[PDB]
Design a protein around this ligand. Structure first.
Ligand SMILES: *[C@@H]1O[C@H](CO[C@@H]2O[C@@H](C)[C@@H](O)[C@@H](O)[C@@H]2O)[C@@H](O[C@@H]2O[C@H](CO)[C@@H](O[C@@H]3O[C@H](CO[C@H]4O[C@H](CO)[C@@H](O)[C@H](O)[C@@H]4O[C@@H]4O[C@@H](CO)[C@@H](O[C@H]5O[C@H](CO)[C@@H](O)[C@@H](O)[C@H]5O)[C@@H](O)[C@H]4NC(C)=O)[C@@H](O)[C@H](O[C@H]4O[C@H](CO)[C@@H](O)[C@H](O)[C@@H]4O)[C@@H]3O)[C@H](O)[C@H]2NC(C)=O)[C@H](O)[C@H]1NC(C)=O
Ligand SMILES: *[C@@H]1O[C@H](CO[C@@H]2O[C@@H](C)[C@@H](O)[C@@H](O)[C@@H]2O)[C@@H](O[C@@H]2O[C@H](CO)[C@@H](O[C@@H]3O[C@H](CO[C@H]4O[C@H](CO)[C@@H](O)[C@H](O)[C@@H]4O[C@@H]4O[C@H](CO)[C@@H](O[C@@H]5O[C@H](CO)[C@H](O)[C@H](O)[C@H]5O)[C@H](O)[C@H]4NC(C)=O)[C@@H](O)[C@H](O[C@H]4O[C@H](CO)[C@@H](O)[C@H](O)[C@@H]4O)[C@@H]3O)[C@H](O)[C@H]2NC(C)=O)[C@H](O)[C@H]1NC(C)=O
Lengths: 56, 218
């Protein structure tokens, strides 16, 4: 109901920047930032979704 | 930092933590009493007014009497390019000026366009991830790296830990790379994820920006 989203459309990217702004995936993994999360969503071939912002 | 080790308390007393309300998000280096340097991409698309700048830290999880906490008054950029990850440096002016003591000191920077060559021995450090889902460090970690020229472009300083899956990870952006005492990079990006053992980590090359740094800090 929080309708949490990130836009992963410009993905994949060969490189990520190193800031920590964690994202908690539907696989119950913490991704380090949007870039690391989005590269995983394209590599899940779209079945990995966003649970919420922050750590798991 | 993946594969490194605990720093000694206040070993690198120019190491700064940048924090938003959830805590640490990037590193920074103290380069004058009222100025810190970081990566441009840490402040892009965040509310700079919310960022607290912590000096004097060692273990982020603990209440430390050592710490000094500022807010950011102004930022200076120099054509950061998010597409190509170029000029990934920022300088933040603090709303005050630090007290210099054993826990907080200003770093030394190289002269303009001094180049490191292939094989130089340096230290990296940071409070980022200890590994793909081992989580963020409490205690400042350091890591011996080597400068590398292969698989790097000329507008970056690159490092690699030979024979180990180690290097910089999320939360170590903006942290220094120190080589013969002087500050040569600002951690900028990875590729293939952290500690791939294949692609070197990329820093922003401070020596390219010293004239610009000087034009701020005197
Ligand atoms: C540059 O910007 C800096 C950072 O700014 C922040 O971040 C940015 C991003 C933005 O969000 C800003 O809006 C934000 O503020 C900024 O630093 C800020 O500045 C604020 C304003 O100056 C400041 O806030 C207030 O400070 C008051 C200080 O009073 C306390 O300390 C003194 C000195 O100790 C005491 O005399 C007081 O009694 C009081 O608390 C008690 O202090 C002592 C006892 O006296 C302490 O005891 C302990 O210490 C002993 C030392 O010997 C030792 O023996 C120990 O064992 C132990 O005894 C405690 O008892 C303590 N009690 C506590 C801590 O509860 C506060 O009074 C005031 O707080 C009150 O009101 C708030 C609002 O209602 C409440 O939240 C709060 O709970 C209290 O009720 C308030 O905090 C910030 O502290 C500071 N922020 C930082 C560092 O993050 C700079 O000012 C600015 N610089 C510039 C512009 O030049
Ligand atoms: C991984 O990287 C680290 C760090 O890398 C360097 O630093 C960073 C910041 C960047 O600049 C990098 O580019 C640099 O590479 C590497 O660590 C470095 O290792 C070098 C040796 O391997 C070393 O050089 C040699 O130093 C010796 C003298 O050291 C003394 O004094 C200096 C100045 O203070 C100090 O830096 C040293 O740590 C050491 O200090 C003394 O230490 C002892 C033990 O802790 C203290 O004694 C204890 O103290 C406590 C205090 O409460 C208590 O009293 C105890 O009771 C007591 O026992 C003592 O107090 C300290 N003294 C002082 C004054 O503080 C030299 O003898 C040596 O000489 C010669 O040999 C070299 C090799 O041939 C030559 O190059 C050289 O020219 C000489 O001929 C060296 O020069 C660095 O000091 C060290 N740097 C740091 C920052 O720690 C590491 O090598 C690298 N590892 C890998 C595997 O790659």
């Amino acid at each position: 109901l929080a309708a949490v989203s990130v836009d992963c459309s410009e993905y994949p990217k060969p490189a990520c920047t190193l800031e920590y702004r964690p994202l908690c995936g539907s696989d119950n993994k913490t991704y380090g930032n949007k870039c690391n999360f989005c590269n995983a969503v394209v590599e899940s071939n779209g079945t990995l979704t966003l649970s919420h912002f922050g750590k798991c | 930092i993946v594969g490194g080790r605990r720093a000694r308390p206040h070993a690198w007393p120019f190491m700064v933590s940048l924090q938003l309300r959830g805590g640490h998000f990037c590193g920074a280096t103290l380069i004058a009493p009222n100025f810190v340097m970081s990566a441009a991409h840490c402040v892009a698309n965040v509310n700079v007014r919310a960022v607290r700048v912590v000096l004097g830290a060692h273990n982020l999880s603990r209440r430390e009497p050592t710490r000094q906490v500022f807010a950011v008054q102004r930022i200076f950029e120099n054509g950061y390019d998010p597409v190509n990850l170029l000029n990934d440096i920022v300088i933040l002016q603090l709303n005050g000026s630090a007290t210099i003591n054993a826990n907080v000191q200003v770093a030394q920077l190289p002269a303009q366009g001094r180049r490191l060559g292939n094989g130089v021995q340096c230290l990296a450090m940071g409070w980022g991830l200890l590994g793909r889902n081992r989580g963020i460090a409490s205690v400042l970690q350091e890591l011996n790296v080597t400068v590398v020229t292969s698989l790097c472009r000329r507008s970056n300083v690159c490092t690699l830990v030979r024979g180990r899956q180690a290097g910089v990870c999320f939360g170590d952006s903006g942290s220094p790379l120190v080589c013969n005492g002087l500050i040569h990079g600002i951690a900028s990006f990875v590729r293939g994820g952290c500690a791939s053992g294949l692609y070197p980590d990329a820093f922003a090359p401070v020596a390219q920006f010293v004239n610009w740094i000087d034009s701020i800090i005197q």
